[PDB]
Amino acid sequence: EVNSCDYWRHCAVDGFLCSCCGGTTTTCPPGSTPSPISWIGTCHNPHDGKDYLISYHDCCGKTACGRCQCNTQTRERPGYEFFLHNDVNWCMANENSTFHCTTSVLVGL
Amino acid sequence: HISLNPDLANEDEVNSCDYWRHCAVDGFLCSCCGGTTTTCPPGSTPSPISWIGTCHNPHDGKDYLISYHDCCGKTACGRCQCNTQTRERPGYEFFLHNDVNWCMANENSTFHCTTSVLVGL
Amino acid sequence: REVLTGGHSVSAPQENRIYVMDSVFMHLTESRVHVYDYTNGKFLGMVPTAFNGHVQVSNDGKKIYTMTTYHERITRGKRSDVVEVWDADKLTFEKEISLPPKRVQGLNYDGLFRQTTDGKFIVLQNASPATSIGIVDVAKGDYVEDVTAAAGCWSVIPQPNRPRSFMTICGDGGLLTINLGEDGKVASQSRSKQMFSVKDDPIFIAPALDKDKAHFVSYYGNVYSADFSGDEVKVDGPWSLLNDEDKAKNWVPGGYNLVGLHRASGRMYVFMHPDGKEGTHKFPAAEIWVMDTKTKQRVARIPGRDALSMTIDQQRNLMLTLDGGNVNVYDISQPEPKLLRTIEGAAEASLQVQFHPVG
Amino acid sequence: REVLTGGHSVSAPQENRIYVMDSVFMHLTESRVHVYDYTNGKFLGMVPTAFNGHVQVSNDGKKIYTMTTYHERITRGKRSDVVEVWDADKLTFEKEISLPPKRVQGLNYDGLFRQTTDGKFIVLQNASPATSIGIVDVAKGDYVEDVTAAAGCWSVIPQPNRPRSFMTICGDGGLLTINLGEDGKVASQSRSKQMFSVKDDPIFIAPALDKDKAHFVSYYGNVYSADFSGDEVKVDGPWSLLNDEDKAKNWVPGGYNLVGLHRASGRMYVFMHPDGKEGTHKFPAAEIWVMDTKTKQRVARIPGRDALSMTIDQQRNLMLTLDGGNVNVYDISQPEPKLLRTIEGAAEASLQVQFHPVG
Numbered sequence A: 001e002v003n004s005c006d007y008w009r010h011c012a013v014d015g016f017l018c019s020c021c022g023g024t025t026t027t028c029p030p031g032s033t034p035s036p037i038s039w040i041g042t043c044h045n046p047h048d049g050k051d052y053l054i055s056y057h058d059c060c061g062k063t064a065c066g067r068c069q070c071n072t073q074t075r076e077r078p079g080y081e082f083f084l085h086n087d088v089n090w091c092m093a094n095e096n097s098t099f100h101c102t103t104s105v106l107v108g109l
Numbered sequence B: 001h002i003s004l005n006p007d008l009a010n011e012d013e014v015n016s017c018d019y020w021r022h023c024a025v026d027g028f029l030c031s032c033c034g035g036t037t038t039t040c041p042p043g044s045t046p047s048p049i050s051w052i053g054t055c056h057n058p059h060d061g062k063d064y065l066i067s068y069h070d071c072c073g074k075t076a077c078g079r080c081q082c083n084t085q086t087r088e089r090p091g092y093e094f095f096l097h098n099d100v101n102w103c104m105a106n107e108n109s110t111f112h113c114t115t116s117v118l119v120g121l
Numbered sequence C, D: 001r002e003v004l005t006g007g008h009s010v011s012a013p014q015e016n017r018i019y020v021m022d023s024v025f026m027h028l029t030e031s032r033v034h035v036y037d038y039t040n041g042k043f044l045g046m047v048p049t050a051f052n053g054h055v056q057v058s059n060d061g062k063k064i065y066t067m068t069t070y071h072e073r074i075t076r077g078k079r080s081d082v083v084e085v086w087d088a089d090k091l092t093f094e095k096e097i098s099l100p101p102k103r104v105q106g107l108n109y110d111g112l113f114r115q116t117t118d119g120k121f122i123v124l125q126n127a128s129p130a131t132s133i134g135i136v137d138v139a140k141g142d143y144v145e146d147v148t149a150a151a152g153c154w155s156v157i158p159q160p161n162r163p164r165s166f167m168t169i170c171g172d173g174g175l176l177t178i179n180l181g182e183d184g185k186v187a188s189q190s191r192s193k194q195m196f197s198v199k200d201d202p203i204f205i206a207p208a209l210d211k212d213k214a215h216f217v218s219y220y221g222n223v224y225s226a227d228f229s230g231d232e233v234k235v236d237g238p239w240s241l242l243n244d245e246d247k248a249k250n251w252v253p254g255g256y257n258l259v260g261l262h263r264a265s266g267r268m269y270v271f272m273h274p275d276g277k278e279g280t281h282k283f284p285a286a287e288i289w290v291m292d293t294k295t296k297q298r299v300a301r302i303p304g305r306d307a308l309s310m311t312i313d314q315q316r317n318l319m320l321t322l323d324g325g326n327v328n329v330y331d332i333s334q335p336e337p338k339l340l341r342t343i344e345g346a347a348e349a350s351l352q353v354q355f356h357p358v359g
């Protein structure tokens, strides 16, 4: 289910799900690097009726995974609220900014 | 015969892999890429080398030698992909072979598109 | 008997040309600009733009400018962010201009890669992830200024009524105006009053741009205006796109480059969809609404054909529409747009199309 | 409270891994190796290989070797042809080995990028367009020898029974054998007698390779043989793959990496299609034929599923086939192959698949 765009954690994913790319929700595929920075989303968990802070770190330094492409936009805002924005490459400040896939890291409520 | 000048033909006919002279083409027909059968699309460069072969002309009944030059130094055109193989042979007959990049000796070897140049009878 | 030649120019005249910016997101290091003839849908050529390229045509119509990122070994090695100058007719590379390694990497909104009205300066968005605006002096072929004043702001809206002024949208709901000197350094700046509520009524960044004012649509279908006929920007709004019967189906705007203004008529084009709710702001157009900006009323509505981005040609009364892969050509000389033709397969992943400047 | 981490290794064991070389011909500057688990079809990772990459796994299963071309600005700037060494488990770049700028740019036949049986040398095809074979000393990370003796020949067939010996196929219809000294320079060489008629019965370059011999199929469905069990190469052929019913229906071979040999059984696998004529030699498989090479008879024929390339694993008695986009897994422990599974969307444009080595 984590490989579905509909999965509740993925509510502001623009990119390829790292769990389809040889990694997981919380691990970059081998030989790709986590972005230290990220857009943030607020997602509703249907299992406990609570909302959570999700961090959308990219995995960087390999070419596009191409698998499980998502474009979900819950609470996403334009570049004037930059850390809520998902139309930019969150690899932008990595040693290599080439975009590989996106993770969905649970931060807190 | 008119069969010999693609400039005079209907575009839909020249831009097809079944067009009589495109008989050993591997790649994107330049005539779909902003160029013509005999001109590279703007900003792409002719390969000085090519694979070669002969094609039968169903129209005037004769056989022609074709030189299959590429255009080089821009990224893949991506349009009108052909993979015809009439009289193509493996790399131990290297200039009859079309599974290599005939842009390989160009100043920039990035493959853009390929075409079919009429050498003669 | 025949010989293959290069050195050739685009077959169609510049007035026939459009530029489809293909991000090629599946293979984002091979982004490119596809050049098409809008009158017949013929492919005229292309400009390679490496990783996540951006594009615009010089205001004089002689050059194409690209912005892109290279690395020595693509996925490793040293970064080079650059602007490139390409000849518009030859589609050949001419000049590379060095940028600091922080040019915006992101989807192809017009406002990320622009120029001053006089054509003398390229004006671009930086993100490191701190934001600033970068100025490139075209005649010099150099980066000449980092507008750090624009921190916390996003995107570039040039003022058509001034040689070298532009605005940007700021996190406080206001606009920041930058006026450049002749050397491309900030000569003056001004900040508007709050135009929109960032939390309650966020606007799409895409301007419906007039000679002396810019209109902006909101997530909930409101309209905001910034008037720059004077040195200080005057802000107004909102007024609603929706009449009473629209409100039942929850019609809202959605898309990327989603609005346009036909300057002579004051008609604003907007991509809309029914059943709007949180997270539907990038949904394809079910419809294009045509609004009179003067009377603040819809004058026409047509089917949207899943479009996401558009552009307008003032001189020929045309609208281009783009669903990501296909480009539709509309005649907009009358209030109701007429569909002229569809260019299929113009791109694999494009969110931006532009006309070649004519007049 | 979750934390994102990198530095991880391929999650499945080596013996489950396959390597699908995706040329991505539509965007050929972004070719890549897709790493798959053949047992369940899970994508395990990938290695980026720029323009028209080629790939193999080190004989010892520890590293992945790629061969590719870079330019400083991709479509302009100086050329760099390289081999790269990558960790097989971490899928990370380790080392670049400079090559002369003439490495073969072409479709991914096995025989363009190989290694010696001892695994100490990488043996690669050059085309400039004059042909030669390049030797890379793996441990030294240097290109060490240029085999211009191989001019007018094509591709590398390593002899599994000798540590540093390999053959290539020549325009005279015979084979050239090259034996390397401990330093990668050519110590000796020999030319076989003519194996096939170049004009009348050209063979596909892909060997069905045993420990001490190799079989080749021809455009017209004949089989040829090179025996290197002894001091000099002994050649034979033709024998036909075709019986009378076959010939009447004009069955011939078609594909790229189109043959395989199961060494234990002597079974040869060949992609075949009916209605063969000039120009069909790369046609998708209508069928896979299974030939017993001792008795010279077909023991099985099954649906081709449009396959174009294949590879065999000895220990697990497996055959993979590949139609450009999808990988099919077959159990070949019995004369009749059993279809185990299809991996869908394993590549966009792949003509080569390889098992991780298990010996």
Ligand SMILES: N=CCc1c[nH]c2ccccc12
Pocket: A014, A015, A058, A086, A087, A088, A089, A090, A099, A102, C028, C052, C105, C106, C107
């Ligand atoms: N998570 C953001 C991926 C992405 C979204 N837009 C992009 C543009 C260029 C590179 C990457 C991206």
Ligand SMILES: N=CCc1c[nH]c2ccccc12
Pocket: B026, B027, B070, B098, B099, B100, B101, B102, B111, B114, D028, D052, D105, D106, D107
């Ligand atoms: N006409 C030759 C195009 C071509 C055929 N095979 C290729 C492999 C890589 C690059 C280009 C090619």
